[PDB]
Coordinates of C-alpha atoms and ligand atoms in Angstrom, one line a residue:
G2 CA 20.7 7.2 8.6
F3 CA 17.6 6.1 10.4
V4 CA 16.0 4.9 7.2
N5 CA 18.7 3.3 5.0
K6 CA 16.4 1.9 2.3
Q7 CA 14.9 4.9 0.2
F8 CA 11.7 3.0 -0.7
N9 CA 9.6 3.8 -3.8
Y10 CA 5.9 3.2 -3.7
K11 CA 5.9 0.8 -6.7
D12 CA 8.7 -1.3 -5.4
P13 CA 8.1 -5.0 -5.5
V14 CA 6.8 -6.6 -2.3
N15 CA 9.7 -8.4 -1.0
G16 CA 7.6 -9.7 1.9
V17 CA 10.2 -8.5 4.6
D18 CA 10.0 -4.7 4.6
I19 CA 7.7 -4.2 1.7
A20 CA 4.4 -6.0 1.9
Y21 CA 0.7 -6.0 1.8
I22 CA -0.6 -6.1 5.4
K23 CA -3.7 -5.9 7.6
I24 CA -3.9 -4.1 10.9
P25 CA -5.5 -5.6 14.0
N26 CA -8.9 -3.9 13.7
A27 CA -11.1 -6.9 13.1
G28 CA -12.8 -5.1 10.3
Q29 CA -11.9 -7.5 7.6
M30 CA -10.1 -4.9 5.6
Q31 CA -8.3 -5.5 2.2
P32 CA -4.5 -5.6 2.6
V33 CA -2.7 -2.3 1.9
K34 CA 0.9 -1.8 0.8
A35 CA 3.2 -0.9 3.7
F36 CA 6.9 -0.2 4.1
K37 CA 9.0 -1.1 7.1
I38 CA 11.4 1.9 7.4
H39 CA 13.1 0.8 10.6
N40 CA 13.0 -1.9 13.2
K41 CA 9.5 -1.9 14.7
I42 CA 8.4 1.1 12.6
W43 CA 6.1 0.9 9.5
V44 CA 4.7 3.5 7.1
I45 CA 1.3 3.0 5.5
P46 CA 0.7 5.6 2.5
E47 CA -3.1 5.5 2.6
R48 CA -5.9 7.6 4.1
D49 CA -6.8 6.1 7.5
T50 CA -10.1 4.4 7.1
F51 CA -8.9 1.4 9.1
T52 CA -8.0 2.1 12.7
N53 CA -11.6 3.2 13.2
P54 CA -14.4 1.7 11.1
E55 CA -16.7 4.3 12.6
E56 CA -15.1 6.6 10.0
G57 CA -14.5 5.2 6.6
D58 CA -15.9 8.3 4.8
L59 CA -13.3 10.9 3.7
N60 CA -16.2 13.4 3.5
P61 CA -16.8 16.7 5.4
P62 CA -19.2 16.8 8.4
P63 CA -22.3 19.2 7.7
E64 CA -20.9 22.1 9.8
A65 CA -17.1 22.8 9.9
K66 CA -15.4 22.3 13.2
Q67 CA -15.0 25.7 14.9
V68 CA -11.4 25.1 15.9
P69 CA -8.8 24.4 14.8
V70 CA -8.6 24.8 11.0
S71 CA -9.8 21.8 9.1
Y72 CA -9.4 20.7 5.5
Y73 CA -11.0 18.1 3.3
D74 CA -10.1 16.5 0.0
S75 CA -11.4 13.0 -0.5
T76 CA -9.0 12.4 -3.4
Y77 CA -5.8 13.3 -1.6
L78 CA -3.4 10.4 -1.3
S79 CA -5.5 8.3 -3.7
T80 CA -2.7 7.9 -6.4
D81 CA 0.6 5.9 -6.5
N82 CA 2.4 9.1 -7.1
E83 CA 1.1 10.9 -4.0
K84 CA 1.6 7.6 -2.0
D85 CA 5.3 7.6 -3.3
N86 CA 5.7 11.3 -2.4
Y87 CA 4.1 10.7 1.0
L88 CA 6.4 7.8 1.6
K89 CA 9.4 9.9 0.7
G90 CA 8.3 12.9 2.8
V91 CA 7.7 10.9 5.9
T92 CA 11.1 9.2 5.5
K93 CA 12.9 12.6 5.1
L94 CA 11.2 14.0 8.3
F95 CA 12.4 10.9 10.2
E96 CA 16.0 11.7 9.0
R97 CA 15.7 15.2 10.2
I98 CA 14.4 14.3 13.6
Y99 CA 17.3 11.7 13.7
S100 CA 19.8 14.3 12.7
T101 CA 19.4 15.9 16.2
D102 CA 20.4 14.5 19.5
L103 CA 17.0 14.9 21.0
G104 CA 15.4 13.0 18.2
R105 CA 18.0 10.2 18.0
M106 CA 17.2 9.6 21.7
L107 CA 13.4 9.7 21.2
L108 CA 13.6 7.4 18.3
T109 CA 15.7 5.0 20.3
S110 CA 13.3 5.1 23.3
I111 CA 10.5 4.4 20.8
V112 CA 12.2 1.5 19.2
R113 CA 12.9 -0.3 22.5
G114 CA 9.4 0.5 23.9
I115 CA 8.0 -2.9 22.9
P116 CA 4.4 -3.2 24.1
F117 CA 4.1 -5.6 27.1
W118 CA 3.1 -9.2 26.7
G119 CA 0.0 -9.1 29.0
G120 CA -2.2 -11.1 26.5
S121 CA -2.7 -14.4 28.6
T122 CA -5.4 -15.0 31.2
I123 CA -2.9 -17.1 33.1
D124 CA -0.9 -14.5 35.2
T125 CA 2.2 -16.9 35.1
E126 CA 2.2 -16.9 31.3
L127 CA 3.7 -14.2 29.0
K128 CA 1.7 -13.7 25.7
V129 CA 1.7 -11.0 23.0
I130 CA -1.4 -8.9 22.8
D131 CA -2.7 -9.3 19.1
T132 CA -3.8 -5.7 18.6
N133 CA 0.0 -5.0 19.0
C134 CA 0.8 -6.9 15.8
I135 CA 0.3 -6.6 12.0
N136 CA -0.6 -9.4 9.6
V137 CA 1.9 -9.7 6.7
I138 CA 0.8 -11.4 3.6
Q139 CA 2.8 -14.4 2.2
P140 CA 3.3 -15.7 -1.4
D141 CA 0.5 -18.2 -0.7
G142 CA -1.9 -15.6 0.7
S143 CA -1.5 -16.8 4.3
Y144 CA -0.6 -14.3 6.9
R145 CA 2.4 -14.1 9.4
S146 CA 1.8 -12.1 12.6
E147 CA 4.6 -9.6 13.1
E148 CA 5.2 -7.3 16.2
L149 CA 5.7 -3.6 15.8
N150 CA 5.6 -0.4 17.9
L151 CA 4.8 2.4 15.4
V152 CA 2.9 2.8 12.2
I153 CA 2.8 6.2 10.4
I154 CA -0.4 6.4 8.4
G155 CA -2.1 9.1 6.3
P156 CA -4.8 11.3 7.7
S157 CA -8.6 10.4 8.0
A158 CA -11.3 12.7 6.7
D159 CA -9.9 15.9 8.0
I160 CA -6.6 16.0 6.3
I161 CA -5.0 18.3 8.8
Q162 CA -6.0 16.5 12.0
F163 CA -2.9 14.7 13.1
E164 CA -3.2 12.2 16.0
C165 CA -1.6 9.4 17.9
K166 CA -4.1 6.5 18.4
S167 CA -4.0 2.8 19.1
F168 CA -6.2 -0.2 19.7
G169 CA -7.8 -0.7 23.0
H170 CA -8.1 -3.8 25.3
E171 CA -11.4 -5.0 26.7
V172 CA -10.1 -4.9 30.2
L173 CA -6.8 -3.2 30.3
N174 CA -5.9 0.6 29.9
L175 CA -2.8 -0.1 27.7
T176 CA -1.7 3.6 27.3
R177 CA -2.0 4.3 31.2
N178 CA -0.9 1.1 32.9
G179 CA 2.7 0.9 31.9
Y180 CA 2.1 -1.9 29.3
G181 CA 2.0 0.3 26.2
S182 CA 0.4 -0.6 22.8
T183 CA 1.3 -0.2 19.1
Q184 CA 0.9 3.4 18.1
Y185 CA -0.7 4.7 14.9
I186 CA 0.1 8.3 13.9
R187 CA -2.2 10.0 11.6
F188 CA 0.2 12.3 9.8
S189 CA 0.8 14.0 6.4
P190 CA 4.1 15.5 5.2
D191 CA 2.2 17.2 2.4
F192 CA 0.3 19.8 4.4
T193 CA 1.0 22.1 7.4
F194 CA -0.7 24.9 9.3
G195 CA 0.1 28.6 10.1
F196 CA 0.7 30.7 13.1
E197 CA 1.3 34.5 13.8
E198 CA 4.2 36.0 15.8
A210 CA 1.4 40.8 11.4
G211 CA 4.0 38.2 10.5
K212 CA 2.4 34.9 9.1
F213 CA 4.5 31.6 9.5
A214 CA 4.2 28.0 8.8
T215 CA 4.8 25.1 11.3
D216 CA 7.7 23.1 10.4
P217 CA 6.3 19.6 9.7
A218 CA 9.3 18.0 11.5
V219 CA 8.0 19.7 14.7
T220 CA 4.6 18.3 14.0
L221 CA 6.0 14.8 13.5
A222 CA 8.1 15.0 16.6
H223 CA 5.0 16.2 18.5
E224 CA 3.2 13.0 17.5
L225 CA 6.3 10.8 18.3
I226 CA 6.2 12.3 21.7
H227 CA 2.7 11.2 22.2
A228 CA 3.8 7.8 20.9
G229 CA 6.6 7.6 23.5
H230 CA 4.1 8.3 26.3
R231 CA 1.7 5.7 25.0
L232 CA 4.3 3.1 24.3
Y233 CA 5.4 3.2 27.9
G234 CA 1.8 3.3 29.2
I235 CA 2.2 6.7 31.0
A236 CA -0.1 8.8 28.8
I237 CA -2.5 11.1 30.8
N238 CA -6.1 10.2 30.7
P239 CA -7.7 12.5 28.0
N240 CA -10.5 13.3 30.4
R241 CA -8.0 15.3 32.4
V242 CA -8.3 18.8 30.8
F243 CA -8.3 22.4 31.8
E257 CA -10.4 22.9 26.9
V258 CA -6.9 21.5 26.6
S259 CA -5.8 18.1 28.0
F260 CA -2.8 17.6 30.3
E261 CA -1.4 15.2 27.7
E262 CA -1.2 17.9 25.1
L263 CA 0.2 20.5 27.6
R264 CA 2.8 18.0 28.6
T265 CA 3.6 17.1 24.9
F266 CA 4.0 20.8 23.8
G267 CA 6.1 21.7 26.8
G268 CA 7.6 25.2 27.3
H269 CA 5.5 27.7 29.3
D270 CA 2.3 25.7 29.1
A271 CA 4.0 22.6 30.5
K272 CA 4.1 24.1 33.9
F273 CA 0.2 24.3 34.1
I274 CA 0.7 21.0 36.0
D275 CA 1.8 21.9 39.5
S276 CA 4.6 19.8 40.9
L277 CA 2.5 18.0 43.5
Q278 CA 0.0 16.9 41.0
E279 CA 2.9 15.7 38.7
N280 CA 4.1 13.7 41.8
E281 CA 0.9 11.8 41.8
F282 CA 1.5 10.5 38.4
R283 CA 5.2 10.1 39.1
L284 CA 4.1 7.6 41.8
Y285 CA 1.2 6.2 40.0
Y286 CA 3.4 5.0 37.3
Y287 CA 6.3 3.9 39.6
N288 CA 3.9 1.3 41.1
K289 CA 2.7 0.3 37.6
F290 CA 6.2 -0.4 36.6
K291 CA 6.5 -2.1 40.1
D292 CA 3.6 -4.5 39.0
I293 CA 5.2 -5.2 35.7
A294 CA 8.4 -6.2 37.5
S295 CA 6.4 -8.7 39.6
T296 CA 4.4 -10.1 36.7
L297 CA 7.9 -10.7 35.2
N298 CA 9.3 -12.2 38.3
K299 CA 6.3 -14.6 38.5
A300 CA 6.3 -15.7 34.8
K301 CA 6.7 -19.4 34.4
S302 CA 5.8 -19.8 30.7
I303 CA 5.6 -18.2 27.3
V304 CA 3.4 -18.3 24.2
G305 CA 4.9 -18.4 20.7
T306 CA 7.8 -20.0 18.9
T307 CA 10.8 -17.6 18.4
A308 CA 11.1 -15.8 21.7
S309 CA 12.2 -17.5 24.9
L310 CA 10.9 -16.3 28.3
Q311 CA 14.3 -15.1 29.3
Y312 CA 14.6 -13.2 26.0
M313 CA 11.3 -11.4 26.6
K314 CA 12.1 -10.8 30.2
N315 CA 15.3 -9.1 28.9
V316 CA 13.4 -7.0 26.3
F317 CA 11.2 -5.6 29.1
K318 CA 14.2 -5.1 31.3
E319 CA 15.6 -2.8 28.7
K320 CA 12.3 -1.0 28.0
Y321 CA 11.6 -0.2 31.6
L322 CA 15.3 -0.1 32.7
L323 CA 14.6 -2.6 35.5
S324 CA 17.2 -3.7 38.0
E325 CA 18.2 -7.3 38.2
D326 CA 20.1 -9.2 41.0
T327 CA 22.3 -12.2 40.5
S328 CA 19.4 -14.6 40.9
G329 CA 17.6 -13.0 37.9
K330 CA 14.8 -11.2 39.9
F331 CA 13.7 -7.7 38.7
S332 CA 13.0 -4.6 40.7
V333 CA 12.2 -0.9 40.0
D334 CA 15.1 1.4 40.8
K335 CA 13.6 4.7 41.8
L336 CA 16.5 6.8 40.4
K337 CA 16.5 4.9 37.0
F338 CA 12.7 5.4 37.0
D339 CA 12.9 9.2 37.6
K340 CA 15.4 9.6 34.8
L341 CA 13.3 7.5 32.4
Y342 CA 10.1 9.3 33.5
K343 CA 11.3 12.8 33.1
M344 CA 13.2 11.9 29.9
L345 CA 9.8 10.8 28.4
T346 CA 7.6 13.5 29.9
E347 CA 9.8 16.6 30.3
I348 CA 12.8 16.3 28.0
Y349 CA 10.8 14.9 25.2
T350 CA 8.7 17.9 24.4
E351 CA 7.9 19.9 21.3
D352 CA 9.3 22.9 22.9
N353 CA 12.7 21.3 23.1
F354 CA 12.7 20.0 19.5
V355 CA 12.0 23.6 18.4
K356 CA 15.3 24.6 20.1
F357 CA 17.1 21.7 18.4
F358 CA 15.7 22.4 14.9
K359 CA 16.4 26.2 15.4
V360 CA 13.1 26.9 13.8
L361 CA 10.2 29.3 14.7
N362 CA 7.0 27.9 16.4
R363 CA 4.0 29.2 18.2
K364 CA 4.5 29.8 21.9
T365 CA 1.4 28.2 23.3
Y366 CA -0.5 25.2 22.4
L367 CA -3.5 27.3 21.1
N368 CA -1.5 30.2 19.6
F369 CA -2.1 29.0 16.0
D370 CA -4.1 30.7 13.2
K371 CA -6.8 29.3 10.9
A372 CA -4.5 28.8 8.0
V373 CA -3.6 25.5 6.3
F374 CA -1.1 25.1 3.4
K375 CA -0.2 22.6 0.8
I376 CA 3.5 22.0 0.8
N377 CA 6.1 19.7 -0.8
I378 CA 9.3 18.9 1.3
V379 CA 10.6 16.2 -1.0
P380 CA 12.6 18.4 -3.3
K381 CA 16.0 19.4 -1.7
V382 CA 15.5 22.9 -3.1
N383 CA 12.5 23.4 -0.8
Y384 CA 13.4 21.7 2.3
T385 CA 16.4 19.8 3.7
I386 CA 17.2 17.5 6.6
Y387 CA 19.4 19.9 8.3
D388 CA 17.7 23.4 7.7
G389 CA 14.1 22.5 6.9
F390 CA 12.7 25.6 5.0
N391 CA 15.3 28.0 6.3
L392 CA 17.9 27.0 3.7
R393 CA 21.4 27.9 4.8
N394 CA 23.2 31.0 3.4
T395 CA 20.1 32.2 1.5
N396 CA 17.3 34.7 2.0
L397 CA 15.3 32.0 3.7
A398 CA 17.9 31.6 6.4
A399 CA 17.3 35.1 7.8
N400 CA 14.5 35.5 10.5
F401 CA 13.0 32.2 9.5
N402 CA 12.0 33.7 6.1
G403 CA 12.0 30.0 5.1
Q404 CA 8.9 29.7 7.2
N405 CA 7.3 33.0 6.2
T406 CA 4.3 32.0 4.1
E407 CA 4.6 35.4 2.3
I408 CA 8.3 35.7 1.7
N409 CA 8.7 32.0 0.7
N410 CA 5.2 31.8 -0.7
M411 CA 6.4 29.5 -3.5
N412 CA 6.4 26.8 -0.8
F413 CA 3.1 27.4 0.9
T414 CA 0.0 27.3 -1.3
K415 CA -2.6 28.6 1.0
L416 CA -5.8 26.5 1.0
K417 CA -9.4 27.2 1.3
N418 CA -10.3 26.8 5.0
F419 CA -13.3 24.4 5.4
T420 CA -16.6 26.0 6.6
Ligands
QI3_1 O1 -2.6 18.1 19.4 C1 -2.9 17.6 18.3 N1 -2.5 16.2 17.9 O2 -1.5 15.5 18.7 C2 -3.9 18.3 17.6 C3 -5.3 17.7 17.8 C4 -5.8 17.9 16.5 O3 -6.1 19.2 16.2 C5 -6.4 20.0 17.3 C6 -5.6 21.2 17.5 C7 -6.0 22.1 18.5 C8 -7.2 21.8 19.3 CL1 -7.7 22.9 20.6 C9 -8.0 20.8 19.0 C10 -7.6 19.8 17.9 C11 -4.7 17.6 15.6 N2 -3.6 18.4 16.2 S1 -2.3 18.9 15.3 O4 -2.3 18.2 14.2 O5 -1.1 18.9 16.2 C12 -2.8 20.6 14.9 C13 -3.5 20.8 13.8 C14 -3.9 22.1 13.4 C15 -3.6 23.2 14.1 CL2 -4.0 24.8 13.5 C16 -2.8 23.1 15.3 C17 -2.4 21.8 15.7
ZN2 ZN1 -0.9 16.4 20.4

């Protein structure tokens, strides 16, 4: 069990894994209720009007986006009952990912991918970067800063627009310099989108969650591909999807990144070797050096000096970029999914995966030994139409 506490939205704030928090935006938000579902991983059942203050309006833009399908409902996820159902849906999707060997590995990589402590201006000093923490409220209304890797939060205006984002640094490129940064996944377990293979099917939301987690893996290890490298669809998406589209990046080009991130891990190793002091109270310098030794799989000699093992690196790199793909999860879930990143259709559905009669950790929609178990009838929006309320596309 990846999440052993089955939280309910109205559960009392115990201050440890159930609390009112603020995120490091500097937009003086009001604390929201959040739930720590696992070490380093929090869930926030709210529409995301926080990560970007430029978008605090859950209202439609005058013209609809041409692609992909978009959906707006300013009242979705505004009630404690939806918040409770959201919380329970997100949790069940984690368990489903965890129940596979690919996912269990991905989640582990995520939990140990602590963002680097490159916060200080003194190069010999380790310091946490504040945008990689959350402020947790205390009985007396004071806040305690807590580190974390991952926050799952509800969607912004466009309810079906799922994304992995994070706070930037004024000088550093945290998602592309090996450092990594706390990841915020805009995601809903309450909706999904369709695709044709006529034959109209729905995407299993576990595949969608795994997709975002894969982005999060890249960004937590600071090896994400610059979103201005497209071809429009960006390399980062092609890589994340995997399968046929993954090989749209010739080997030589890939070797450029493979080396560009080898030397980025090289630097981190040296910054670590040259550290003489640390900021904060709980963590010793050796402790943090250790954390980062696990994260990046560094090699250490008897004198406690770190170096980058090129074979260890290759394994980690390909593990995060080639083995952790949506294509591969599709195989492990034994579900049906579109074959190319763009092979979707403009269909969005309201769904409800909480009830076991609709969706299970092991089978998803394709419930075992039933009609739904044959030819992914579970995912057929017409055969299993009781689980996919087709929604009015926005235009
Ligand atoms: O890749 C995504 N997130 O990691 C995309 C980006 C955004 O959306 C898209 C989808 C396709 C294009 Cl060309 C542009 C924007 C969000 N989704 S997604 O939630 O994974 C998604 C949503 C709806 C569809 Cl129909 C397909 C994928
Ligand atoms: Zn993506």
